[PDB]
Design a protein around this ligand. Structure first.
Ligand SMILES: NC(=O)c1ccc[n+]([C@@H]2O[C@H](COP(=O)([O-])OP(=O)(O)OC[C@H]3O[C@@H](n4cnc5c(N)ncnc54)[C@H](O)[C@@H]3O)[C@@H](O)[C@H]2O)c1
Ligand code: NA
Length: 174
């Protein structure tokens, strides 16, 4: 309904798995800077506490392009639309908190976070939060990403819910 926070996630797993199981984080590592760099995700230590999402549809195409054009990447990508709730945190309050704690974000990191569309979910997004999926198509010759077939999650639970506006609890502060 009106006002509800929705986010997107690009993932290689298909709706049949994801609508049923939802998303689960790699692990329980709450080092946010590590996560935001990608160091604790699939290409890294694979123990991130967080599940990455974005508010920006425009950003999802670019994320998908990055994955599609990487060497050894095969298979498909889907854009999931997700209802956000108190499991979801915009990163800015936490970045501000880490900064007050003496953690340094480089000029480059701050440029990457500039548009403020990043939202992380902690531990688990239920299948019932996921509205729908769209298979993404890739034309490697013109670096073009478009929407393929869409699928609706019949198990979606409607409601008007919002992100947690605060700092992520139990953050790791080295
Ligand atoms: N994916 C997004 O929509 C998205 C949005 C905003 C920012 N980012 C940034 O991209 C970087 C990587 O994020 P990501 O979410 O793509 O990495 P990720 O490790 O969460 O996902 C990459 C792939 O790993 C697999 N995967 C993820 N979790 C799994 C699990 N628990 N069990 C088995 N397989 C799993 C899936 O193939 C997934 O597509 C981070 O810096 C992140 O903040 C991603
Ligand atoms: Na709080």
């Amino acid at each position: 309904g009106p006002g509800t926070d929705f986010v997107y996630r690009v993932d290689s797993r298909p709706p049949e798995e994801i609508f049923r199981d939802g998303f689960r984080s790699h692990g329980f590592n709450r080092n946010l800077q590590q996560h935001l760099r990608g160091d604790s995700c699939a290409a890294g230590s694979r123990d991130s506490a967080f599940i990455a999402t974005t508010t920006s549809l425009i950003e999802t195409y670019n994320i998908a392009r990055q994955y599609y054009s990487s060497s050894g990447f095969h298979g498909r990508l889907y854009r999931y639309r997700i209802r956000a709730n108190n499991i979801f945190y915009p990163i800015q309050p936490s970045v501000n908190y880490l900064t007050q704690r003496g953690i340094t974000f480089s000029g480059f990191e701050r440029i990457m976070m500039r548009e403020d569309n990043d939202i992380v979910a902690v531990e688990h997004i239920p299948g019932e939060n996921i509205v729908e999926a769209v298979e993404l198509t890739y034309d490697r010759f013109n670096s073009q990403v478009s929407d393929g077939p869409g699928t609706t999650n019949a198990r979606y639970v409607p409601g008007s819910t919002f992100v947690n506006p605060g700092v992520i609890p139990q953050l790791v502060v080295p």
